[PDB]
């Protein structure tokens, strides 16, 4: 915890707070990105941030799309995850590494938000449940 910041917008917190908490955390880590240092950030369950944003948009009477998500749910995560950058030498050389977490349903990799963030992030650490209940932990696919 000497190096960790912990931003928590939990399940009882309001949906704008769950929507905004990845951006708050990414700003707090962009401090270390922008001043030459290095940062790590885990946005744990962006699949719950997208549900908070779906709640906010559907309560604003905005027309839902695929899986009742708004049309700008891609922009929600691409605005966030493009800030995890490795800066040039002239801007400091700082870096920010993101580890977004997405929860699938039955190994459905082809969900809407899952295929959104797969096409935003660089790599992918897919964790399978068939390897997990066979005791192989970390259950890396």
């Amino acid at each position: 915890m000497r190096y960790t910041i912990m931003v928590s917008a939990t399940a009882s917190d309001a949906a704008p707070l769950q929507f905004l908490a990845p951006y708050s955390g990414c700003a707090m880590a962009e401090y270390f990105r922008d001043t030459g240092k290095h940062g790590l950030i885990i946005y744990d369950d962006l699949s719950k941030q997208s549900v908070a944003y779906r709640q906010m948009s559907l309560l604003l009477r905005r027309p839902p799309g695929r899986e009742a998500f708004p049309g700008d749910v891609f922009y929600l995560h691409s605005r966030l995850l493009e800030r995890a950058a490795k800066l040039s030498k002239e801007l400091g050389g700082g870096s920010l590494t993101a580890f977004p977490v997405i929860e699938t349903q039955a190994g459905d990799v082809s969900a809407y938000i899952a295929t959104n963030v797969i096409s935003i992030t660089d790599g992918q650490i897919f964790l399978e449940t068939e390897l997990f209940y066979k005791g192989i932990r970390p259950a890396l696919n």
Binding site: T10, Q55, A106
Partner: protein, 105 residues
């Protein structure tokens, strides 16, 4: 379910006990909040639930915890609609569960 939480929150917060709260068919809590969301003209989300589904479930299930005075432990009957664990009501309910006790015939 909020009234059951209030009666249990008295025993946790004042008496300092370990309370059991049997929310019988949490799916019916979900479907009743879905009905009051549709009556209030809110646009329903995915499969037909309220757009505030996880937030209503969280406002229920986040008061069931251990404080420094006591604890409420919830044994909730879960109905799985159309035998689908990926349906949003049990898949949102399963995020809060710590154990499942499966009674089988």
């Amino acid at each position: 379910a909020l009234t059951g939480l209030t009666v249990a929150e008295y025993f946790r917060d004042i008496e300092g006990q370990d309370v059991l709260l049997f929310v019988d068919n949490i799916f019916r809590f979900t479907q009743a909040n879905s009905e009051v969301s549709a009556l209030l003209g809110r646009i329903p989300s995915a499969v037909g639930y309220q757009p505030t589904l996880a937030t209503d479930l969280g406002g229920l299930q986040e008061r069931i915890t251990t404080t420094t005075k006591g604890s409420i432990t919830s044994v909730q009957a879960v109905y799985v609609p159309a035998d689908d664990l990926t349906d949003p009501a049990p898949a949102t309910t399963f995020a809060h569960l710590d154990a499942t006790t499966v009674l089988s015939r």
